[PDB]
Amino acid sequence: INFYKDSYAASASKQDFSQDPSKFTEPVVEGLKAAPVL
Amino acid sequence: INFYKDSYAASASKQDFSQDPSKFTEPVVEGLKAAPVL
Amino acid sequence: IESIIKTATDTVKSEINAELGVVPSLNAVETGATSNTEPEEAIQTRTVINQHGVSETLVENFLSRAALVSKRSFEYKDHTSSTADKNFFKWTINTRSFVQLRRKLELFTYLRFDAEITILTTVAVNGYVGLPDLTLQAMFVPTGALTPEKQDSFHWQSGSNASVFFKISDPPARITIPFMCINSAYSVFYDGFAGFEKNGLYGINPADTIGNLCVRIVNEHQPVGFTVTVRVYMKPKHIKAWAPRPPRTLPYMSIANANYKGKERAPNALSAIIGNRDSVKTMPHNIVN
Amino acid sequence: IESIIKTATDTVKSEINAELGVVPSLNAVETGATSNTEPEEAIQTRTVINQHGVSETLVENFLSRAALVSKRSFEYKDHTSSTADKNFFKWTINTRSFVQLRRKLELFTYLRFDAEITILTTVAVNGYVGLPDLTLQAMFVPTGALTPEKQDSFHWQSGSNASVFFKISDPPARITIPFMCINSAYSVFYDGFAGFEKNGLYGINPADTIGNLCVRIVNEHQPVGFTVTVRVYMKPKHIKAWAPRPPRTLPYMSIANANYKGKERAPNALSAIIGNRDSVKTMPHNIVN
Amino acid sequence: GVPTYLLPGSGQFLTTDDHSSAPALPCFNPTPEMHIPGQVRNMLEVVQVESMMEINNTESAVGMERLKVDISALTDVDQLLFNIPLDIQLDGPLRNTLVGNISRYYTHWSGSLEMTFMFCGSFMAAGKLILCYTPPGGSCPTTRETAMLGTHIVWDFGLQSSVTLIIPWISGSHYRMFNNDAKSTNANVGYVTCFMQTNLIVPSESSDTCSLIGFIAAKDDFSLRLMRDSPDIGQLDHLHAAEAAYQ
Amino acid sequence: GVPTYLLPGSGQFLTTDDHSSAPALPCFNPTPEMHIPGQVRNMLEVVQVESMMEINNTESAVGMERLKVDISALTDVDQLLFNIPLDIQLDGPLRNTLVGNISRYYTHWSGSLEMTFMFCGSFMAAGKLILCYTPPGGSCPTTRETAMLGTHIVWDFGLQSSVTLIIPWISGSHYRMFNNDAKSTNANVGYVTCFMQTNLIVPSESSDTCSLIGFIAAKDDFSLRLMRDSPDIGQLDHLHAAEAAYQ
Amino acid sequence: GTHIVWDFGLQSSVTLIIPWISGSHYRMFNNDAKSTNANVGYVTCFMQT
Amino acid sequence: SDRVLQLKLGNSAIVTQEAANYCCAYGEWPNYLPDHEAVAIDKPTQPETATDRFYTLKSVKWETGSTGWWWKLPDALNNIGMFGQNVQHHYLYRSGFLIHVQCNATKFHQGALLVVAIPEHQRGAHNTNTSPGFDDIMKGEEGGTFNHPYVLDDGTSLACATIFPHQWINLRTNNSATIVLPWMNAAPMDFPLRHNQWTLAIIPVVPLGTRTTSSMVPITVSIAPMCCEFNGLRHAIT
Amino acid sequence: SDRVLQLKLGNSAIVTQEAANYCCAYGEWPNYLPDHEAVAIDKPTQPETATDRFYTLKSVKWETGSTGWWWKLPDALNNIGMFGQNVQHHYLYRSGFLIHVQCNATKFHQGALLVVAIPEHQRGAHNTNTSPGFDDIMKGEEGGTFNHPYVLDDGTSLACATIFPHQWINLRTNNSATIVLPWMNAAPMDFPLRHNQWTLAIIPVVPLGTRTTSSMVPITVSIAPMCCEFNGLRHAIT
Incomplete structure (x- = not known):
């Protein structure tokens, strides 16, 4: 329920389930063969 | 009426009329011929 | 066999039976089965189209009742020289303290439910000026986590804890706590010990404790003192129940265990649950005309 | 690779491995990558269909909590001969004063969010007659703009400023402030100086300050004095968060900087964050039976 | 906005209310349901299980002795052995039963009952009993020639150790009431009653006194109505260690 | 108008509520979103990053010295080198980790962990260690012949400087609890434990003492539950210059 | 070990199977009774009740 | 044709010719833990015939003033055979149980025994505020004795204990009771040394009686674990 | 084949034969400012090879009691070459950075260096309420030294600094660390002389050790700005 004219007035948006943990866990460009990395 | 984002917030669920009293009244596997059981 | 039952079963008419080999009134209790003798097989019956509903004995209806679970009276005053709940209390949430709800839940071994919590607050002037419309904070703190130790403590800033602010004037505060056990059901009874050593508590799985309810008055103390009583009501909902149990017969002693003593005499004594009659041939409320 | 994750990952069964050339438990930490060793590759596993949700650790859920950001107590009385908040206060809005919200926001370098502001107001009689239902004005004044200097000042006419009038009796006042940074995100930390000279503040980009909250009591003073406490709660929403950070470990000192001292001893001391045990071979809570 | 008006009832807390309410833990994921044996979805499943009557609710009967009825060889014919009041609401042999305890959470009840009696004498013990149900209106029958004008079963002790006396739903009204007045026409x-039909006849080497255990269950035509606090539990004080929940 | 009634809960301020509310700045146009590197949308992305354990949490260990474990050549076989408590909730080597700090904002947790150990001796240093995970129930193993009955990895120091000990989610319940009772069966x-498998064997010209750095991360089977205030931060006073926000 | 619990009843007899439980295909009838190939x-019979 | 029964598990077998149609608790049968209910990710050990076999406990003497006997599961079995060894070497276990209770007497004896499997039989103590300790609850193979079987040592009632999975040994009718128990727990697996899912209770509702020359009448409990799984291998606790 | 690496930018090139698979910060690569994100309307100057090239800083000596070193970007480069000249003559700049850190030693040496790029490393001061001043923060080409590297000079923790883009120089394993940084700012461009987007931190987590005869072991930082843009041309600030 949101009867306001400004969109930022809406309730919280808790449906963004997209994740990309590899920008934190694997920030190399050689994707490591799961085999030695070195 | 339920305008909440979490499903456990709903009102009580009073429509489950399924019963299986034989798991309490007849917990044998030989269904007893209604004839002597023994 | 599982089926949908909305009304009590009908009766079919039956006639005279005189058949060798067929004794439907005889049974064998030793098998553990309840007798399957129908009234049609025991007496000569009529046809009855039974329209009696069964919905009030649904487990959801039987347990979705708001029941009192906590009642704390505390003084609302200046507490510089008291020894006692100094404008706030902590309550380790349990279902064991009020015996009407406790006995109903202890009809079952396992319960899965959400808990609708309702908080009624009342105020009395200490022994008149009027009743103040105080603001209260009920903060849900998980079991064993850090609870506030002062009315004015910075723990009440509640950065991640759920807190509900509510008046005395307004309709009681109400929130729903989800089913939060680490298991798929609460253990109503627990035949075990909570720790890996042997000093731990018997009967208490802490996996089944909701949390701590930390309730303060937000207001600074008034010049006069008040006594504030907070009542907490729990209503289970979306209930699943497993493995029914013999009802509690003797009076409860502790919230920590199933310990028993019984009353001094019947009824609900240790040696005699049902009150006595003079003999097995004595009809206690016999109609005499 | 970006994907939609609603539940924690399943486990596949695995068997015996004895292969030359393949060492999935060996890694190279030096590359900066976290180990990619799966449990299937380290031990012999079963098949687990994991149904555990991940939604409570969504950044929106983790930060859309109403947290206390401001708590001002001021006297409501005749102020002809006081030196102090004379029936009103100004508050330069910040997220730095209450450490539960501050540490959560400081898990991130950049935050973009709207701010739902909730204003709780409570009154106490000075050290009884009853609590008055006073009307308050909370006026949003931008950063550095002209704030009122009197309770009765003509600045409160609020010709373009957003003002909210609200009672003590009514449900707290609530408005939403939009994401109002001149940048696409707030800088939670700012490795820089706000001015073009060198006397300016380190760490404080004023682009990330919401504004001034100017709160008065609208009522003329009563013949007796009251102490009024105003609590402000902020809940971020529609949150985007970038570049996570090591959590704050030492106690905060100032709202103006990241300055640190640490506690006197472990835990959370400068030389020792984790509390000590006797040796690296000492198991601190060892089960002994 | 919407023009609205509040009505009688606004802001009341009804303990039986049925409403959605504010979830305190947003995005909480409850633990996934696991199959557990023995789910109960209607309490009438519990009342259909037979459970022991305390027919020997007498002084000089201690503990488990109250759950059995001793039967002895007699030297007079047609004798009364025991009777059983059918008053669930006041204290009798039916109260601490599965059907008794659950029903006392309700005020109104309907439907047939069944009494099952297991003879627990020796193999060598023989006998016949007559188990009689008398519809209300008069005094409890004390002679065998009066009692079996009513509903009855003649039981032969044999390989089958048990019989069932059905107590058929025999009532002018759809429901009976669990009120305290036991002599009420709506209660x-x-x-x-149980009489000797022949006699308990045993060996010199069998025990000359044998025991019956009585069970009661509801049938599936049984219904309960008007939920109420059970008079089987109460407290006048706080329970022990209830204060430690605040400390 | 519309007949309405207020319910329990009306006018309460729940800090976890989720509602639209009145925009204070009508027609405000927020600044357009710019791509910023490193967006985080679920905090479980943060716990999967490995971070340093403080295994050497001892007196006489100062600052960064606490983040490494010194390993020396021994003259007895099969020796214990260090152990690591797996209690996140109380204070141990896991608390000030990425997985540790974020998890302490929650009460319940599930899923596998991984410990990564980087050997930081010289190129010329050789050795083998055994890294053992013991499921709970007994005392921590102190001899090598007891510990490796459990889950373990034998690590050879080589070109790859690191191994991973997976701590598999080994639990009767779906979740464990971050309660203060560390000896709890739900905690x-x-x-x-780490034992010598062979020995640290080095040059006369290499350092005779070498260092391990331990890391921990969660795997992507990890989940957290029941959000709570973190016990890792607190104030008893106002912070400095907090009053100047009112002046 | 391998066992049968026998109730005395209408059937007056039970059978305890001694299953061929041996590392080798055959055992030997040699005089050394304690031999691993013999x-x-x-x-054993115990009272059960 | 339901009086005779043979139960074959592993190398163990039991015959009776006076059974009375065995109880399957709540109409369930023991199964292994399926993948959609599992939690522990390690591959479990399923010893099958090494552990899923009848173990006979110490018999107890049925006498005139006996109050009853109880055994807690898996506690009664945690030191017996390869079951006990798997229990000691693993953090987690899961099993069902096949319980067979034996008591014969003459055709001139009388007596009724309530043989009931009680899930989560949390015991109360009598006439004190102090909870039962470890030694009160954990009796091992010997089991315990009812203090007040009329209230099942927990302030409830014997008379309503037929709500639980049960059979009767009525000495006139049968000489054995058989109860098949599924896994009965809130969690899919459990630590065997600190929790007891089931309590076998055997209660004299009608006491032993005869006017023959007396014999010792013992009651013998044979218990087969069923579908044993074990997770979390380590050293033995002992 | 990820141990050897050549980096060619402009007239500059760097070879190493003991790399360990370079870090691209948050999986990003430096780019020029696109039209749909731009703010400043003047046509920017993009000097490319004149500025996007490796600049080597002054090497620092790694010793036994070293606490660590930090350099702030673009501050360390704001007086160097044509980058420094473009910075001085323009109000606005934007760039990424390619950081290469070099430290070799013998096969008998040990030591671990945490080489981490910290975005918005707002420094705290120790044991005072006074914020760090201009001279504390803005060290230029020389950079600074960690006071308390265990808390990263900001009351957080070294132990959790691996959340930032980082590599390690473990002297047994590799002799070089490479980190590619994108533009990391709330604004698309920024004034270079009053704000530092990135802080390169190099921290001795395992100290230098050998029992060989000692050598000076220096640590050398080469930094290439990447995709340099400059807006708002005027006279030089100097």
Whole structure:
């Protein structure tokens, strides 16, 4: 329920389930063969 | 009426009329011929 | 066999039976089965189209009742020289303290439910000026986590804890706590010990404790003192129940265990649950005309 | 690779491995990558269909909590001969004063969010007659703009400023402030100086300050004095968060900087964050039976 | 906005209310349901299980002795052995049963009952009993020639150790009431009596006294109505360690 | 108008509520979103990053010295080098980790962990270690012949400087709890121990003492539950210059 | 070990199977009874009730 | 044709010719833990015939003033055979149980025994505020004795204990009771040394009686674990 | 084949034969400012090879009691070459950075260096309420030294600094660390002389050790700005 004219007035948006943990866990460009990395 | 984002917030669920009293009244596997059981 | 039952079963008419080999009134209790003798097989019956509903004995209806679970009276005053709940209390949430709800839940071994919590607050002037419309904070703190130790403590800033602010004037505060056990059901009874050593508590799985309810008055103390009583009501909902149990017969002693003593005499004594009659041939409320 | 994750990952069964050339438990930490060793590759596993949700650790859920950001107590009385908040206060809005919200926001370098502001107001009689239902004005004044200097000042006419009038009796006042940074995100930390000279503040980009909250009591003073406490709660929403950070470990000192001292001893001391045990071979809570 | 008006009832807290309410833990994921044996979805499943009557609710009967009825060889014919009041609401042999305890959470009840009696004498013990249900209106029958004008079963002790006396739903009204007045026409169910039909006849080497255990269950035509606090539990004080929940 | 009634809950301020509310700045146009590197949308992305354990949490260990474990050549076989408590909730080597700090904002947790150990001796240093995870129930193993009955990895120091000991989610319940009772059956994870498998064997010209750095991360099977205030931060006073926000 | 619990009843008899339980294909009838290629083990009867 | 029964598990077998149609608790049968209910990710050990076999406990003497006997599961079995060894070497276990209770007497004896499997039989103590300790609850193979079987040592009632999975040994009718128990727990697996899912209770509702020359009448409990799984291998606790 | 690496930018090139698979910060690569994100309307100057090239800083000596070193970007480069000249003559700049850190030693040496790029490393001061001043923060080409590297000079923790883009120089394993940084700012461009987007931190987590005869072991930082843009041309600030 949101009867306001400004969109930022809406309730919280808790449906963004997209994740990309590899920008934190694997920030190399050689994707490591799961085999030695070195 | 339920305008909440979490499903456990709903009102009580009073429509489950399924019963299986034989798991309490007849917990044998030989269904007893209604004839002597023994 | 599982089926949908909305009304009590009908009766079919039956006639005279005189058949060798067929004794439907005889049974064998030793098998553990309840007798399957129908009234049609025991007496000569009529046809009855039974329209009696069964919905009030649904487990959801039987347990979705708001029941009192906590009642704390505390003084609302200046507490510089008291020894006692100094404008706030902590309550380790349990279902064991009020015996009407406790006995109903202890009809079952396992319960899965959400808990609708309702908080009624009342105020009395200490022994008149009027009743103040105080603001209260009920903060849900998980079991064993850090609870506030002062009315004015910075723990009440509640950065991640759920807190509900509510008046005395307004309709009681109400929130729903989800089913939060680490298991798929609460253990109503627990035949075990909570720790890996042997000093731990018997009967208490802490996996089944909701949390701590930390309730303060937000207001600074008034010049006069008040006594504030907070009542907490729990209503289970979306209930699943497993493995029914013999009802509690003797009076409860502790919230920590199933310990028993019984009353001094019947009824609900240790040696005699049902009150006595003079003999097995004595009809206690016999109609005499 | 970006994907939609609603539940924690399943486990596949695995068997015996004895292969030359393949060492999935060996890694190279030096590359900066976290180990990619799966449990299937380290031990012999079963098949687990994991149904555990991940939604409570969504950044929106983790930060859309109403947290206390401001708590001002001021006297409501005749102020002809006081030196102090004379029936009103100004508050330069910040997220730095209450450490539960501050540490959560400081898990991130950049935050973009709207701010739902909730204003709780409570009154106490000075050290009884009853609590008055006073009307308050909370006026949003931008950063550095002209704030009122009197309770009765003509600045409160609020010709373009957003003002909210609200009672003590009514449900707290609530408005939403939009994401109002001149940048696409707030800088939670700012490795820089706000001015073009060198006397300016380190760490404080004023682009990330919401504004001034100017709160008065609208009522003329009563013949007796009251102490009024105003609590402000902020809940971020529609949150985007970038570049996570090591959590704050030492106690905060100032709202103006990241300055640190640490506690006197472990835990959370400068030389020792984790509390000590006797040796690296000492198991601190060892089960002994 | 919407023009609205509040009505009688606004802001009341009804303990039986049924509403959605504010979830305190947003995005909480409850633990996934696991199959557990023995789910109960209607309490009438519990009342259909037979459970022991305390027929020997007498002084000089201690503990488990109250759950069995001793039967002895007699030297007079047609004798009364025991009777059983059918008053669930006041204290009798039916109260601490599965059907008794659950029903006392309700005020109104309907439907047939069944009494099952297991003879627990020796293999060598023989006998016949007559188990009589008398619909209400008169005094409880004390002679065998009066009692079996009513509903009855003649039981032969044999390989089958048990019989069932059905107590058929025999009532002018759709429901009976669990009120305290046991002699009420909307309450009283009548009587169950057991007489010797022949005699308990045993060996010199069998025990000359044998035991019956009585069970009661509801049938699946049984219904309960008007939920109420059970008079089987109460407290006048706080329980022990209830204060430690605040400390 | 519309007949309405207010319910329990009306006018309460729940800090976890989720509602639209009145925009204070009508027609405000927020600044357009710019791509910023490193967006985080679920905090479980943060716990999967490995971070340093403080295994050497001892007196006489100062600052960064606490983040490494010194390993020396021994003259007895099969020796214990260090153990690591797996208690996140109380204070141990896991608390000030990425997985540790974020998890302490929650009460319940599930899923596998991984410990990564980087050997930081010289190129010329050789050795083998055994890294053992013991499921809970008993005392922490102190001899090598007891510990490797559990889950373990034998690590050879080589070109790859690191191994991973997976701590598999080994639990009767779906979740464990971050309660203060570390010996609880719903809390205790068991133990991680490191033994010499062979020996640290080095040059006369290499350092005779070498260092391990231990890391921990969660795997992507990890989940957290029941959000709570973190016990890692607190104030008893106002912070400095907090009053100047009112002046 | 391998066992049968016998109730005395209408059937007056039970059978305890001694299953061929041996590392080798055959056992030997040699005089050394304690030999690993000879010894079959033991049959014992206890009261159950 | 339901009086005679043979139960074959592993190398163990039991015959009776006076059974009375065995109880399957709540109409369930023991199964292994399926993948959609599992939690522990390690591959479990399923010893099958090494552990899923009848173990006979110490018999107890049925006498005139006996109050009853109880055994807690898996506690009664945690030191017996390869079951006990798997229990000691693993953090987690899961099993069902096949319980067979034996008591014969003459055709001139009388007596009724309530043989009931009680899930989560949390015991109360009598006439004190102090909870039962470890030694009160954990009796091992010997089991315990009812203090007040009329209230099942927990302030409830014997008379309503037929709500639980049960059979009767009525000495006139049968000489054995058989109860098949599924896994009965809130969690899919459990630590065997600190929790007891089931309590076998055997209660004299009608006491032993005869006017023959007396014999010792013992009651014998044979218990087969069923579908044993074990997770979390380590050293033995002992 | 990820141990050897050549980096060619402009007239500059760097070879190493003991790399360990370079870090691209948050999986990003430096780019020029696109039209749909731009703010400043003047046509920017993009000097490319004149500025996007490796600049080597002054090497620092790694010793036994070293606490660590930090350099702030673009501050360390704001007086160097044509980058420094473009910075001085323009109000606005934007760039990424390619950081290469070099430290070799013998096969008998040990030591671990945490080489981490910290975005918005707002420094705290120790044991005072006074914020760090201009001279504390803005060290230029020389950079600074960690006071308390265990808390990263900001009351957080070294132990959790691996959340930032980082590599390690473990002297047994590799002799070089490479980190590619994108533009990391709330604004698309920024004034270079008053704000530092990135802080390169190099921290001795395992100290230098050998029992060989000692050598000076220096640590050398080469930094290439990447995709340099400059807006708002005027006279030089100097």
